[model samples]
Target: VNSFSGYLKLTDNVYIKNADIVEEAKKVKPTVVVNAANVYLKHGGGVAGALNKATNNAMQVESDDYIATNGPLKVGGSCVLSGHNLAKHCLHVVGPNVNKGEDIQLLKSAYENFNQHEVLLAPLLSAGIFGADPIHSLRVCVDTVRTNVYLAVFDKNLYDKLVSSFL
Candidate 1:
């Protein structure tokens, strides 16, 4: 696979870019990869599903365990899961769904709370099955993220469009 050699600015020094999340995970080797989750921590599908599959379903177990102990996560709260496949850790956060106005706001809070890591790998939260605006979700991520952040996107066309629009 080709190495990720580019980035697109979103706000200030924050940026956005595209790469296979798992592929880039091997390269950057971030301390944590953020997992998008519901309050129940059910990582059933989308990026969360792929990650759960990659880690041999360990993420689901960890998420379930976290919820079992701490109860459901609020929209602006998060939990850290072990990175069984790629990163050293995984941050699980529940963001907005559908056309919710608070989607971007909650995402910004989640990213803000998880900024303690040196480097982080994050997907475009709430943009897929959750139906939030991908571009806007990414913008919130960029605006609030403080550490070294990699926004992973697998679709090549989306990658190109993002690069052209934001770089």
Candidate 2:
């Protein structure tokens, strides 16, 4: 039943936590806070919203500058930003919406792009409002995640269900 409070080790280097991601970052200090963001990087709601609020909107301010100078991100596009407060950086990826009938590759590309990082203290991409039970969705992450894998789940129950599944 109920046994854990925060992080659990899954490997010598890999770990997962049931946490509010931003809060988790505060404890750990300067690890990347991954965002499953909107294509515009709006930080309007969900994961990006939490990140924006906690980083004092400094993160979104830079995101806006990026959108203004370059262009909006593609569907499966990914990018990185310097963290304003409790993080060293923010690694962002836009995941496929429904991810059905065809776009699993887009979802993979998003995860694939983000996984290129050396270490991870990240959240679940594409699992937020998207229909990623592409159960396959979770599997792709497990397969791709390299060293220092740290996942901060949104809910304790998500941890309850997720950690067991990852194994």
Candidate 3:
């Protein structure tokens, strides 16, 4: 693997770029918390401008949904709702981008919340950012997310990332 800014690239096979995880959460907070419910064209604006796009994609807040209400406590890099009543709220976590090591950290943090009983479910597909392969991302995500929370996977190829890795 070639080295670049602490990230390893597989001998020109593919270069995994570094990402800023925390910033993405901050960007999405406006819609997830302040706006609550909004749906814009998925994948149009990535975490870089999630805050603004969310405004345009704003939907009415549903009681069954719970956003990252807590301050600075980003559950995962990417999270979407599952519309379930298992725990009064369904927090969907999306990722910064697929591949690399982003999914590992994102699911890890989600499982952490699950351990604390903060949530009862975690659906992975809301982000819809997986590659066509599917298995690679799913395996990484399942390995990391361990809790009573339920997981949803739409595209196995697409996964997630950590906040610190977002930038």
Candidate 4:
């Protein structure tokens, strides 16, 4: 998949006292949403690292999710997918062609967005309308504006796809 094929949704931040994240999900009416709080926990690469992140209130996981593929996703590949628990049935995304440096840029942008308080780093996966049961599976491929974020996504996707295919 050239990464150009997928779905896209855009929205502004919600400002309300006691606003419910799930209620806010009504805007997109997503098939599903992930609401992943700390991905560093799911992908810290080690136990100590997870502890360190948790102690520091930093990302301690990489989201407990997967992107199944017929073929391997590599460093150069890009894709958008959603697999987890939610309502519509699945989540869709769009990705951009990726490279290593580009990945860092996306992270930088996210940090800037947060640090500057210019915007919130809200991800589409965090919604809750998909109503999937236990969410054993709920992912879809898509595209992205992020350069390396796209690459990183592809690298992981391809890695998993290859490893799982071998099984």
Name the weakest run of 10 consecutive residues (lDDT summed) in model 1. 1-10
Q: What is candidate 2's lDDT per residue for 1-167, written digit by digit as tens?
A: 22223568766655677788888777766456678787888898877888899988988899999999988988788888887786788888888877443376677677777557767677777776665663466567767665456777777776777767765
Off by over 4 Å in 2: 1-6, 11-13, 99-102
At residue 29, give the lDDT of candidate 4: 38
Model 3: per-residue Cα lDDT over 8-104, one tens digit each:
2322122222333223233322122111111221323333134334334332242213333522224243334422212223343443344333444
**Arranged by lDDT, best first:** 2, 1, 3, 4
Worst ten-residue run, lDDT, model 4? 133-142
Best by TM-score: 2
Clash count, one per candidate = 0, 0, 30, 41
Question: Best lDDT goes to which candidate?
Answer: 2
Task: Report every candidate's CA lDDT.
Answer: 0.72, 0.73, 0.31, 0.24
User: Please, what are the lDDT tens digits per residue for candidate 4 over residues 1-167?
Assistant: 22211222211222111123233233333433222222212323222232224324222221223322233323223222322222232212211113212332232222222222222212322112212111111121112222111111112343345234321
RMSD of each: 3.3, 4.3, 14.8, 18.0
Tens-digit lDDT track of model 1 for 60-151: 88777787898998887777778877788888877776645565566677668557775667887777777876777766776677766667
Q: Candidate 1's error at 82, in angstroms?
A: 0.8
Model 1 scores what on Cα lDDT? 0.72
